[PDB]
Amino acid sequence: NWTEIYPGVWKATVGKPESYDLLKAAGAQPNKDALSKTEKVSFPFANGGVSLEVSGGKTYLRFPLQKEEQLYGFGLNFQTVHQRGKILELHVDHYGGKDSGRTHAPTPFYVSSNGYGVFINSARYIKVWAGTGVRKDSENFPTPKDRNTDKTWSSRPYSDAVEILVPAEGVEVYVFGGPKPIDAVKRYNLLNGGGYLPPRWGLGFTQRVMTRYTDKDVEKEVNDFKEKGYPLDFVGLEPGWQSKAYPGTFSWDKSRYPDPTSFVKKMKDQGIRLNLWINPYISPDAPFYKEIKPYTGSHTVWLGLVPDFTMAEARKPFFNQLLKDQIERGVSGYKIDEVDGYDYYLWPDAAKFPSGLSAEQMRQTYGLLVQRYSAELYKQRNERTFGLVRASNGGGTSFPYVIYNDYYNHQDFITALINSGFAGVLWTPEVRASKSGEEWLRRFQSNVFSPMAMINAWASGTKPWSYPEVEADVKKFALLRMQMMPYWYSAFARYHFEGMPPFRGMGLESKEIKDQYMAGDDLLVAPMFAGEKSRKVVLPKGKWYDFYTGEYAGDGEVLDVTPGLDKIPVYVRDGGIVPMMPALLNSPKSNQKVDLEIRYYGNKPGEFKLYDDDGETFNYEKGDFSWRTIRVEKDKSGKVKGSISAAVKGKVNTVGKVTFTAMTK
Amino acid sequence: NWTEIYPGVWKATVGKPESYDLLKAAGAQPNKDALSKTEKVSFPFANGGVSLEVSGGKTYLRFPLQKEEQLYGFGLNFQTVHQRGKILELHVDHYGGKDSGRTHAPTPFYVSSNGYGVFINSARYIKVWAGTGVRKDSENFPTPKDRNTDKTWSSRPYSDAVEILVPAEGVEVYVFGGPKPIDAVKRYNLLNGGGYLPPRWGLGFTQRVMTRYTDKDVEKEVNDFKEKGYPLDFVGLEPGWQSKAYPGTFSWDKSRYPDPTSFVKKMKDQGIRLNLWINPYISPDAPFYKEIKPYTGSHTVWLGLVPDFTMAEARKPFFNQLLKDQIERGVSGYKIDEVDGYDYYLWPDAAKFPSGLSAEQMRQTYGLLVQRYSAELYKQRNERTFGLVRASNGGGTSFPYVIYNDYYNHQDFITALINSGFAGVLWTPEVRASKSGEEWLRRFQSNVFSPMAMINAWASGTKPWSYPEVEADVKKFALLRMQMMPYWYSAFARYHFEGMPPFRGMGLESKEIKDQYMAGDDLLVAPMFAGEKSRKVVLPKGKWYDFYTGEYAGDGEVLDVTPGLDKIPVYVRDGGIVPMMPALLNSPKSNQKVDLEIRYYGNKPGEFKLYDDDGETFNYEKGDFSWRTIRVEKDKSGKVKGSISAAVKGKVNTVGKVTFTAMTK
């Protein structure tokens, strides 16, 4: 039976579900308030064809499909966006070069073009046949043909269902109503708690430095950023901050970091936060080793113990060490590495954990656990965090982490960014190295139109200016990222409050689009790749305007575009609005007013909801935030006319002078 | 507890095993007689380290490894021979281009270089970590190192066990003693019933013809073989013999085969047997469709019903039709196609079968079932068969079928032939098409040193002579195949009686050898590949002689060989013997005496056991067979001296005049 638990959200419990699952692993709390405000809509499967069965130790699910229905999701795929006709086993792993279901966030959630979604709340590995099976008792069984004589004989005849096998005696399933595909995604995300509300400093630029950097090396890099006029909010430290790595001590190396408290404070006094690399695997020389040992798995990763983070006895020593030795010195956050795979690095499924949780369910949720309990340390102190994680899953929407990996195909990086929007996670196509200045700038351009603007120089030692043929353009895109901070922050506020993914695929207001994405509500981004002079851009219905010049670009048509090296193709919807702050080098503080230039595109009257609060604490949870409504139009003479709603009494107000600019002459 | 059930064979039952498994699926009967004659040997795991555990619904197995122990097996792999350090999920499938465990015969049997083997008797998909897991409580846990400072830090530290996960509440495990790796393989094979004893006609040449051939077309091809002087024993008919294919009617097409009884008889009267392509998927127009329908799975393959061959009610209509419409007309055997995969063609694991058998266990054993019940039809009539099958598994050693596939990488074809010897199945690297005459001859050369000498022209329409630059050499290798018939037949007799795989890897009397194999007891085959002028050949200790000239080649060393296009590198052990019959075009009948030239290589006194019987019935089961012992030496003057043991009273005797030839001048 399907219990309508929120508007457009239904829940069925099939058989006897396991006591551990994805939502429970994450400790994911629904945002009831936001959910209650969504439209009531009808059950998406109104005409039967749904079958939920327990048998032979497993749970068999079947959901119907109509002809010309297309599917999206099944997690963080890198080479496919359309999922109908695919066969997958959803299984946490480092991405392996093919979309098989093995990936960093193999979210068991899919979305239909008909405007609904389905989430399977199991922490097991899950098999999916997304319209490949052909059933003899199907209402749509194609007529059998003779391959010997009939030219129309087809190797892939019509399949009318999504079939899913969960290896357990039952499962919780959730179905999400529409009417549009994005509505289903938003409800799914809100069931997960909505997206995290990042700190403003998390949307600034981050530089990760080489593994071997000393505190002195870091101080110098910071000084070079300032001297050269490049923005920077947080520096990423790689494994050499620890006295041992692989496996880890979780303590500052005495030689590379003699005085941690002093170093963390100096960087902070200069506006620079720190984010620390960890993997969660415990060295014998870690100060809590003996205490944690009984609460660790049978198998090690890089010879380090694997904590069973489902046990308080493992959590307390691990997270206490992070709290006391780093967070309390001022460390802003973490990069939770290598909680994904490969199978030959992580523990095998044959491993045993002291809680009794299967190693399979541990593999599926390890990332979720480390995100969960690390984030909680920051929430307890009324401070936001923002960091990186190499694995996540269903249940992880609300965590303050962005996914990254060691793969590097640029096209595929963009495709993953698209799919991140169907998967309830954030993904950054990071910049590390490049053969050429061209590739370096192309990668930097797409990166600044993503959740996290980052160069990860852990091995490369690169900086934004390392490629001199393109350094001036790289600088421009770095400063653009800062200038766009109010646009991104408002987008992330929609992620938190309404569950709206800030980066997502097209047609989420015919053929597969793998290389364009929406970035916030107003911008269509169409990246260039190295070696290309031009590309096609498919524009949805409605008028679009050039992001740079403001000129009319097109409407419901395909463009051939030759942008030059200095531009990433970006197009703004009619009436679209991008609030721009000044090109600050550091994110603004909560007590700081910032002027805004409201760049308004096209001729349709536009409306933007600018989010404002202190940008660093959880005070917004008590209602200390505002949405400032901005409206812009051209008057009868063609001159820009704009308004902003008034600041609200008693609320934080960081909006300075506001000027309006009609970008379309 | 380990019950020693035969000499060098032990059985443990862990937990509660499933009532269906591989041995039961195959109906595999042990050859007690042959097994009782093997040496008693000690239990291979004498020092502990074995763990058999049931937990969380699954069976966890761990077997210890010593340092420098190497592993072989885990089924029919195409790119790897050494299996230590590999991670696999054993899963029946068409080979996918990588050794992941997905393959045609994913036999859950492995062999150690220390001289033992292990077989996991489950029809589930099975996970294997062959010395990749590193356990914290291991006796051999490497010392944790610091990757920040230590150059010796290793990403793959020492693992001391094979770990296997079976998804069931228990399992039967079998362990096989040594002392040598081949001894373990032989016992495994004998537990399965030994290899099938093929008919002599099955070791002749087979031509499969284009799908669209009519009976007239086949008659003509047969006449061309005879006219051109090429050998032929059986012709393969492809899907057009059926009135419908994909899915199938299992009845002769009225238009292409008007008079089946007459056609089958004409071909037979000319010495030519027929082997018929089937897949087991049922057309609505098949004459037994209505009867079988309730005993078929929920899902179809190419819109054909999938019989549950575990039910007598499915077996009877299916196999009765084959019996009455084909076997009783004289059809010699079948090619059981497309019982492997891919996942998007075969039924999904979510399918349901009317017997209640999981679709997983069905996938794992479907090939075994169709081999089993088809072979039985022939045994009931006291006639041997020999054919082809695209899937098999543990339990399938005794079946009269050779595996083939639609992959075509030549190197990998040879590697699969090597691995076939560790996997309890036969594999043929078939010939279909080639870009060049060179490739065509190279492929033909390796093929005639394999279980089945075959061109499969189902799509290509090729014949042995299709490439005129190499046609004379192709002919020579075809006639060689016939001349070598007594050598091959004796090798296959060892397969049946002693479990000795007729094709196998090296070191089965340091580094991985993927491109050489032993063919019978005496011949080391080292194939050339197209584009190569020369290759290395690693010779084991002991003297070796050139197969063609008889000259000394080497001893415990590596050769660089430039054979020419007209030769496949083959080397004969010291004292090795190849009995040669004449270059007949058709296999000899049971009532026929055949002269033999005994080609003796080197100088060590040699001994060969020539197997002899009627070559077509199961009378050998009643004791109507003989082993004729042949001994050859050079006398003090350097002249060949040979003997053959006397024919046995009352037994079939096909040996004619016997002459001896010392190949090494």
Ligand SMILES: OC[C@H]1O[C@@H](O)[C@H](O)[C@@H](O)[C@H]1O
């Ligand atoms: O060794 C440090 C590196 O470790 C990798 O696992 C990670 O993906 C890299 O981004 C970097 O952190």
Ligand SMILES: OC[C@H]1O[C@@H](O)[C@H](O)[C@@H](O)[C@H]1O
């Ligand atoms: O359609 C006929 C063909 O079918 C394939 O599945 C098979 O591998 C080929 O060898 C040939 O039999």
